[PDB]
């Protein structure tokens, strides 16, 4: 995956070199976010598309295969800022809010599926929190293979190979890192 290296290098180069005259808005967005222990980043797409048209060309193409390479791309940056050596640091969530063109709810029919869509509605009720997983260890029922699975986003079945079978893999909940989830429902 040299391509992912090529994309992530562009995201680092987008965070470290970005200049609104003259403060670096993102780079400081980062620091001021890790200190309060927010562990998040908010990208402004207009700055993004200003910086390179290209990376927004791909990010509006296949978002769900890319955006997590952007997450890892930014957390690899907070490693060089928030700490220094020669932990643990969760991969930050990015929140991007931008103008674009409002697409009303009725007008969502297929065709834009897996393409970022800005819209507007009144939330009805919020569903009770429940955890998904982020990083969970797994051991085999027999050969006892110790596998650390990094689950990403955005469902995903467990690997069957180290009889053995068909799916001899247990979730270790004593070491598994978890996040949260909501389920809004909007009218």
């Amino acid at each position: 995956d040299d391509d992912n290296t090529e994309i992530i290098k562009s995201f680092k180069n987008f965070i470290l070199e970005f200049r609104l005259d003259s403060q670096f808005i993102y780079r400081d967005q980062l620091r001021n976010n890790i200190l309060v222990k927010n562990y998040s980043l908010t990208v402004n797409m207009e700055h993004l598309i200003g910086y390179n048209e290209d990376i927004y060309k791909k990010l509006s193409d296949e978002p769900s295969d890319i955006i997590p390479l952007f997450e890892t791309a930014i957390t690899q940056v907070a490693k060089r800022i928030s700490i220094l050596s020669r932990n643990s640091l969760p991969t930050f969530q990015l929140i991007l809010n931008s103008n674009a063109n409002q697409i009303p709810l009725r007008d969502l029919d297929s065709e834009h599926v897996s393409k970022i869509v800005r819209l507007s509605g009144i939330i009805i009720s919020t569903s009770v929190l429940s955890s998904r997983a982020t990083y969970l260890s797994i051991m085999c029922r027999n050969c006892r293979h110790t596998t650390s699975i990094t689950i990403n986003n955005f469902t995903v079945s467990l690997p069957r190979s180290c009889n053995c079978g068909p799916d001899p893999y247990i979730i270790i909940h004593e070491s598994s890192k978890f996040i949260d989830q909501q389920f809004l429902k909007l009218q």
């Binding site: 070199e17 970005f18 200049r19 609104l20 207009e46 700055h47 598309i49 200003g50 290209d54 063109n101």
Partner: protein, 553 residues
């Protein structure tokens, strides 16, 4: 009538002192050219750190309140865009004080013809007539040296016959249309290049200046491109990008469009509100609106993709933006759209088309802000002037966008109401000329400003004539909300469809002064421009009848 550099050294010698200085440069008035000029002028002063006063004058009548009130130590004065028409020597008077007169008022104007009393008989000027109309201009030359100071009965009769002989041809002059030769900014730059400053934002000020008026003709501007493009060639930020880079990062040539707000608005809304395209495609008509969509069907651009903001459209459509138009627009007669334009890129913020910037400033001038009410309103425009002045600065972009969110809205007003007219076919073809009046409309608050009616008047004179046989006929407009029937009425000039043989020299300036000199019925030349006047509904109708006849054209 002087070298620009030498007029400069003069305004240098009378300037710097203890206490400094004193000079008031008058920026006037509502014309974007003024800003364009006086900003590079003011920056030039700041270079030598010469103290200055700068005054936002609206009314031509308003200038008297200022010059007659506050002057003390000011030995060198500068003025912009005023005096080319009406002379200030009689208007201000002057009253010579102390040859080698103490105060020098520089008058910069693009308007023609100059007042006769101005150029000859040097008192207050120090004229800026150079170099556009020099000329000769032998008609003004014989106007004085003959006139001044001017068997014996036949020599008296001969003399008087000669006097009227000169007075006739002289009467031909100074009674004429007011038409801008070259943008005052251009000349300030010609003055600026002799001193040796090549500054980039300066040059951008020139580009702004030139492109202030392309909404209305060129007229010479069609040949101004050498004088700009060469200068764009006299500098360059880098031989090659080197993306971006974050600094310099400057202006460049791109296939720009008379199309409206391409970069800061959604494409479809960018055709639908554009001024040149309103006309040819009959967009006020529901039957013609479709023809646009047929354009998009020809381009293969989705309707949904046309509705989306221009920043975010796909890259393929961007790379094909300069091709697809060639492939298609030719068929609709829309082939004149693509100019060679100037675009300055600030990089990570965006880019801005030379013209669109001007749309932002104009947007700023009217919005985003019995004699007491009009004075207070003109005052609000005076304050608003600086809100518009600030947007020129590079360091604050944050409010420039406040202009653009307005510039869109205005069109959404202007277009709308514009259509509200064509549905009722309110155009009166009359006989000698075309004329209109808006008796009722939504939100006349926007239409208070002279320049708003300059742009509505512009999209309308542009709409009625494609051309559109026959006989381009100048248009008239009127509007009223408050201030007790002020009914502002602005003069207009015909638009040729890119094939322009003559300047055509707006005649309303003369036709109005003929009426002020007749019954003068509530006629007010208070606005700085000779084309635009005020009227009352009581006296507007007899005024309109006296406008119809006698026709000077």
């Amino acid at each position: 009538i002087s070298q620009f550099s030498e007029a400069y050294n003069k305004i240098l010698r009378n300037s710097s002192s203890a206490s400094s200085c004193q000079l008031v440069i008058f920026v006037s008035c509502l014309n974007i050219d003024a800003l364009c000029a006086t900003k590079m002028l003011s920056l030039l002063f700041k270079k030598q750190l010469v103290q200055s006063q700068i005054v936002p004058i609206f009314g031509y009548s308003e200038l008297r309140r200022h010059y007659s009130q506050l002057d003390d130590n000011i030995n060198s004065l500068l003025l912009v865009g005023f005096g080319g028409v009406i002379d200030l020597e009689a208007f201000l008077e002057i009253d010579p004080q102390e040859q080698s007169f103490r105060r020098d008022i520089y008058v910069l104007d693009a308007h023609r013809p100059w007042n006769l009393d101005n150029i000859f008989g040097s008192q207050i000027i120090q004229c800026f007539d150079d170099g556009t109309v020099d000329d000769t201009l032998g008609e003004e030359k014989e106007a004085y040296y003959k006139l001044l100071e001017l068997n014996d009965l036949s020599k008296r009769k001969q003399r008087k016959k000669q006097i009227h002989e000169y007075e006739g041809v002289l009467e031909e002059y100074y009674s004429q249309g007011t038409t801008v030769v070259n943008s005052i900014s251009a000349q300030i730059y010609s003055l600026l290049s002799a001193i040796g400053e090549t500054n980039l934002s300066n040059l951008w000020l020139n580009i702004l200046g030139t492109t202030s008026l392309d909404i209305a003709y060129a007229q010479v501007y069609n040949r101004l491109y050498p004088l700009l493009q060469d200068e764009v060639k006299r500098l360059t930020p880098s031989s090659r990008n080197s993306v971006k880079t974050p600094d310099t990062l400057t202006l460049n040539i791109q296939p720009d469009y008379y199309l409206f707000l391409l970069r800061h608005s959604s494409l479809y809304d960018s055709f639908y509100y554009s001024n040149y395209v309103n006309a040819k495609l009959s967009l006020w008509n529901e039957n013609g609106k479709k023809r646009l969509h047929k354009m998009f069907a020809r381009m293969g651009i989705p309707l949904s993709t046309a509705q989306e903001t221009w920043l975010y459209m796909d890259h393929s459509i961007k790379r094909e933006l300069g091709i697809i138009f060639d492939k298609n627009l030719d068929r609709y007669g829309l082939q004149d759209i693509i100019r060679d334009g100037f675009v300055r890129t600030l990089g990570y913020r965006g880019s801005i088309s030379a013209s669109e910037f001007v749309e932002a400033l104009t947007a700023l001038l009217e919005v985003g802000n019995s004699a007491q009410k009009l004075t207070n309103l003109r005052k609000r425009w005076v304050s608003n002037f600086w809100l518009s002045w600030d947007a020129l600065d590079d360091r604050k972009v944050e409010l420039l966008n406040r202009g653009i969110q307005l510039a869109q809205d205005l069109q959404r007003a202007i277009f709308n109401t514009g259509v509200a007219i064509l549905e009722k076919k309110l155009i009166k073809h009359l006989r000698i000329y075309r004329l209109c009046v808006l008796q009722d409309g939504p939100d006349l608050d926007l239409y208070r400003n002279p320049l708003t009616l300059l742009r509505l008047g512009n999209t309308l004179i542009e709409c009625c004539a494609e051309s559109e046989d026959k006989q381009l006929l100048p248009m008239v407009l009127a509007s009223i909300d408050e201030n007790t029937d002020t009914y502002l009425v602005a003069g207009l000039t015909p638009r040729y469809p890119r094939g322009t043989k003559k300047p055509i020299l707006n005649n309303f300036s003369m036709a109005f002064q003929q009426i002020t000199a007749e019954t003068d019925a509530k006629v007010r030349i208070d606005n700085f421009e000779s084309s635009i006047i005020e009227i009352r509904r009581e006296d507007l109708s007899p005024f309109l009848e006296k406008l119809t006849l006698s026709g000077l054209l």
